[PDB]
Design a protein around this ligand. Structure first.
Ligand SMILES: CC(=O)CC[C@H]1C(=O)N[C@@H](C(C)C)C(=O)N[C@@H](Cc2cccc(O)c2)C(=O)N2CCC[C@H](N2)C(=O)O[C@H](/C(C)=C/CO)C/C=C/C=C/[C@H](O)[C@H](C)[C@H]1O
Length: 165
């Protein structure tokens, strides 16, 4: 069937910025895609709603997804604290690529990053599972608030999120 579409409504210090939409590559990485989908709807009782982007590096990536500790060290998946690296079929081929952050092999949780460039050296190191479908302009706007070391000058939060059909 068709790949799912989820969206994030982004805010800056509580003020709405816009919506970014993503396609999840469920035909390639079903387990990884399903985790992100369910975390976006909130249907298992926990998820990205209300969490923030803790590390933003202009020209490289925007990372978020820690809804358990809210400091960059937490997050969990719908299957448990960690799940395996499903495969490394997809590559970090350009801006808008959605990939899973990790702390070593087979430690996928909820943290993810959005690529704002093609970065070959990431390949084989992270599982790619989607891409920005619409709202790339919104991702660019979020970048204005990051810095070389990743610390944001303003709170960038996911004010709301879900699935679109
Ligand atoms: C439980 C605990 O305390 C662990 C904290 C530790 C960590 O493992 N954080 C994890 C999260 C997911 C739990 C984490 O986040 N992993 C990074 C690891 C990484 C670092 C550098 C390159 C890389 O490919 C992977 C992760 O998956 N991402 C996604 C891709 C970009 C990368 N973070 C990143 O931010 O790269 C920066 C980069 C390459 C900038 C280039 O300009 C350099 C930052 C390093 C941070 C190190 C932390 O002390 C360590 C991750 C800690 O959080």
């Amino acid at each position: 069937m068709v790949n799912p579409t989820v969206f994030f409504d982004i805010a800056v210090d509580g003020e709405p910025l816009g919506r970014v939409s993503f396609e999840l590559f469920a035909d390639k990485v079903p387990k990884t895609a399903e985790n992100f989908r369910a975390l976006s709807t909130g249907e298992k009782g926990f998820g990205y709603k209300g969490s923030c982007f803790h590390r933003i590096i202009p020209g490289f990536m925007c990372q978020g997804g820690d809804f358990t500790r809210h400091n960059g060290t937490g997050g969990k998946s719908i299957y448990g604290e960690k799940f395996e690296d499903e495969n490394f079929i997809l590559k970090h081929t350009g801006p808008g690529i959605l990939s899973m952050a990790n702390a070593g092999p087979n430690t996928n949780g909820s943290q993810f990053f959005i690529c704002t460039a093609k970065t070959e050296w990431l390949d084989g190191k992270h599982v790619v599972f989607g891409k920005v479908k619409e709202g790339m302009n919104i991702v660019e706007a979020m970048e204005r608030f990051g810095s070389r070391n990743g610390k944001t000058s303003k709170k960038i939060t996911i004010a709301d999120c879900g699935q679109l059909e």
